[PDB]
């Protein structure tokens, strides 16, 4: 081997471990592109934790080519996962037309039971298993192609326990209706790449993009830690220069990404050094505030760069509240996380 | 020398030619940080067809040190440009506190009357040269923090014939407020990098970023060429990933940015290959329609890439009007263009 | 979603400069990706050949992987077809040292080259009138020391079972497989080998291309290719260099620099010399008249335009402007010579 | 906006590896950039040291440019604080060959080395107690052909004008300037001379970076960073070369790659070797026990873990793992020689 990490830095929540996560892919043993041991090299070198190969279980199209069940390819995994102490979770891709669509059942002890006639029954294995079962891109326009609603199957499947959470984020895909869903009935907020081609094919790492993928805040770095994150909706979707999740997760996440100190004071105002210590790029944007308050209308903190920061106090002003919305750290749709300096 | 040009691949309007211009720019003869040559070998390097290195008027800090008339920069980017087939146009910039702000007056003839006690005179120089004289970054929170006003001088300015156009881009700055204004004004939309550093420091070349510029559509390649197009309104703003313009220029423009071909038919519905022959990314979102005509919510067409694109035919329908908007191509503030593509 | 990146590189006169790649894998032997991936990788590299070559000897996947050994190929014709990639069927015969690995392509059916012996392996592919060449005669893994020709290479050399050999695979660059084919009278070949996905090998963002083929034929068809390997109208290109025969190399460097007389006085003369490739050029002054005073040693990037000066000292009213065009290799540790009268 | 890029290099025992570049110029002279963006430039490239050495002779703005020999350096001094970058005042004598062009750094004051005899600005420089050295020795523009050393080279180098040879300028290499320090007790300097920006004369995207000096020194100050000078602590670090004396190579390599030995049976051992730098390595198998058995070459990327297999032959129970850095240039020609015994 030639065994090269590109860490993905992002700060740690108090008490939380900051998991990368990728838990929807495929091989040649469904519909994907590549041998599975590939998954495996991309996820050590992409700085990610852990994965999933979810391979569908109704749709094989090398089947007459390749030949083995529904648990092969996370067999084929193992040993590599294990040397390059990436985290495997077996998991599977219960492929059905809308409605209820696509979800996949991860934390499987067993994929084959989940090849059923009716797909009532494949949930009700996955069910059994005590699987963590989230709904695959609600809104793919193959499946609702002029609006991503909720059908009366997914509140079945959501009454009936056989719902966790729902992808907010796949590959390319930003889908903001499943952001108010999972607010709204209180679900894990995922985000995944579900590659079917080699991962460089599909991402111009060049121009720094990332395989969507999503932050776990774990208490331990382990399959039942990834788990009780799960459970507990301790995620955030990280999609292009978005990240997604509950404001009570992204407004801590945000202090940690950001070192913001007083290089400065006077009469006439303050001035700041913040500086991105992450591979984040952060944008703001200022909100309502006290006019005398004087400070900009826009800016970007790229990753890794300190800003000096200027705040001017007109008229009498010895202070305020320096307030904006961090745009891309997404608390609801087209909402923003707010936040505020205060001098 | 070691000349290396890499065109800008873009398309021409049917009676014109499109230039790719820069007519907002410094160098160590005023804030700039480059020698003025420079200016000229950044210009032919990144496809440029034209430029006006305007230097501030009023602010020239290096004055100690750099000793000359406000006339110097151009003359010593005479000869290089000539050599490298770069039109020069000769322009400075008339720096002022808000309100009027700043100005740039190209198409001088000489800069040095535009030094002047009062603001006014210092327009009426200009003017006496028959510049052709555009607003700078309105948006710029320095001098407008809170909102982009228009303010009764640029009222004044604007009846005096001292106002041609305005910058609804410069740099990484966005202004849509200057959209709306040259649109109910009949203005100019200009575009310009207002470049300082080096080139190279301000755009991420090797994401595949690009100095923010104006396409000039003129019906010759000439310094009269240019002016025309100007007087004309016959330019776009090209930002980041926006293009900014009137939808009489823009229309035309992405029809000429896609070559899109029917490949197939029946009676399920039909197939296209649509290939963006630019080096310009198109975003495309699907926009009201008949239902029954089955395709695409959101597509983005990569530069120089051809896609395949099915339309289907629900119900019994046999065609119908694929509608879209191109989200990228922007006709007015938070409008892109609408685009049918009858079938 | 279909992009190309062509390959900016001249034409011979008479001849189409085809860009192929004649060795790869896929999971149909040890490869790692499916073999339709072979062939969007080619179109996107600009090639407009390849042969997928999988081991007939070792296929570590067959337990899942449980087709015949035609069956990759076959999987590809239609891909390849839509995207106007030749597809030449080859298979790599897989064995110790000596013989070691050879492809043989250009084969009607890749089933039958499966034998115990392996000198049946190469009568059945002789049988199907297959081109073949020496894989990485140069692999450490074989020959770990000396890349040595074997007494069993001269056997299938004299009984027409070598055609080529590789003198470049993938990061791998064999030196004394150049003499050979220049004693020998074969064609010098340069493939990836693949097993990876392509961009796992290579860094596209530093410039970096797979290891491949020119090939100058007359027509952009698979007779076409077959016609220049049978008559050795080629060259390697790996890395900065490209690896030929002087007799291609040197109307080949002919075509890819414009030179320019841009101006002449008693002093000297001004050329002006513009690398229209992507290749980059090397050139190293060689023995000259020291009357004309000219560069030690210079560099031209692929699309760059040079203005370069010669000037003449004492009374000289020109000369030759002697050099070498060191990454352009016409044998071992010799590259193409060549002058600039003026 | 302040983004730095941290060069991942190791440091030896007892010293800090700093990174200078001792070489520059700015519009002050015939660069093409305001000096702060120099200071900027280096912060931003990793490094910890610069010397802004405008020509004294040669200052082809001077009718716009109307300041004094100091005044480039002045109008760094400020920023060079805020970003803690070491700033050494310098200048660059630029005369005819021979003696061609020298820098002198550590200056107190660069107008006094303004004279009409060279020798007089050398005396100028000597009486601030500079650091002197010969700058690109081999710039064809000068030498034209061979890369020698003159009379005059010798009688400053005598006078104590000559504490050091540039060995390596921008993208020019010269190797004749490694044996002549080696023969004369000099340091090795490695610079870019950057004129343009840099961005302009290298290409980040392609991993190059600024021709520099390694300075092995014993505090990040101006003071660190002349004694290092004074007793060659440096090495050159010029594209994928690193050039430096053995006694500074050896120890450097060994601080560059974490060697563990991860398993061994009667078959041999298998080795994993890290590359912790962001320097590519390149090792060539030398001379060695054929019953060894192990890679031909090898090239190690820079912060990456390889798994080596050495193998044993007939009854071999370990031995030396012998090869050469070939990046690593200790002479002309030669590479460090490293073994690994098993
Ligand atoms: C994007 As799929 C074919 O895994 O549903
Ligand atoms: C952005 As400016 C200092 O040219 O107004
Ligand atoms: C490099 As191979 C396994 O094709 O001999
Ligand atoms: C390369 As120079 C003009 O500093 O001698
Ligand atoms: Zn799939
Ligand atoms: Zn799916
Ligand atoms: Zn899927
Ligand atoms: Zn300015
Ligand atoms: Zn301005
Ligand atoms: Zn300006
Ligand atoms: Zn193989
Ligand atoms: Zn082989
Ligand atoms: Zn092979
Ligand atoms: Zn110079
Ligand atoms: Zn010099
Ligand atoms: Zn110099």
Request: net charge negative; charged share 25%.
């Amino acid at each position: 081997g030639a065994q090269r990490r590109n860490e993905i830095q992002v700060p740690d929540l108090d008490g939380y471990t900051t998991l990368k996560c990728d838990f929807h892919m495929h091989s040649v043993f469904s519909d994907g592109l590549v041998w599975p041991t590939v998954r495996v090299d991309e996820a050590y070198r992409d700085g990610l934790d852990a994965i999933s190969l979810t391979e569908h279980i109704e749709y094989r199209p090398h089947k007459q080519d390749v030949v083995s069940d529904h648990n092969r390819s996370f067999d084929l995994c193992r040993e590599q996962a294990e040397k390059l102490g990436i985290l495997l979770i077996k998991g599977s891709e219960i492929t059905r037309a809308m409605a209820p669509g696509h979800f996949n059942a991860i934390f499987l002890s067993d994929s084959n039971p989940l090849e059923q006639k009716d797909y009532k029954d494949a949930f009700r294995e996955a069910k059994k298993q005590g699987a963590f079962m989230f709904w695959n891109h609600p809104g793919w326009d193959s499946q609702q192609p002029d609006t991503t609603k909720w059908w009366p199957e997914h509140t079945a499947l959501y009454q009936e326990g056989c719902m966790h959470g729902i992808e907010v984020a796949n590959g390319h895909l930003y889908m903001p209706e499943a952001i108010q869903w999972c607010l709204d009935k209180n679900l894990t907020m995922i985000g995944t790449s579900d590659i079917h081609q080699p991962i460089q094919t599909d991402y111009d790492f060049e121009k720094g993009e990332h395989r969507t993928m999503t932050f776990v805040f774990a208490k331990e770095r382990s399959l039942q830690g990834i788990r009780e994150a799960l459970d507990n909706r301790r995620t955030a979707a990280y999609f292009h220069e978005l990240l997604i999740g509950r404001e009570d997760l992204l407004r801590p996440f945000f202090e940690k990404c950001v070192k913001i100190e007083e290089v400065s004071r006077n009469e006439q105002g303050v001035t700041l050094s913040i500086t991105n210590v992450t591979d984040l790029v952060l944008k703001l944007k200022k909100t309502a505030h006290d006019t005398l308050l004087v400070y900009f209308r826009d800016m970007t903190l790229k990753p890794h760069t300190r800003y000096t920061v200027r705040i001017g106090f007109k008229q009498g002003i010895k202070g305020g509240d320096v307030n904006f919305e961090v745009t891309n750290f997404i608390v609801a749709p087209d909402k923003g996380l707010k936040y505020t300096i205060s001098l």
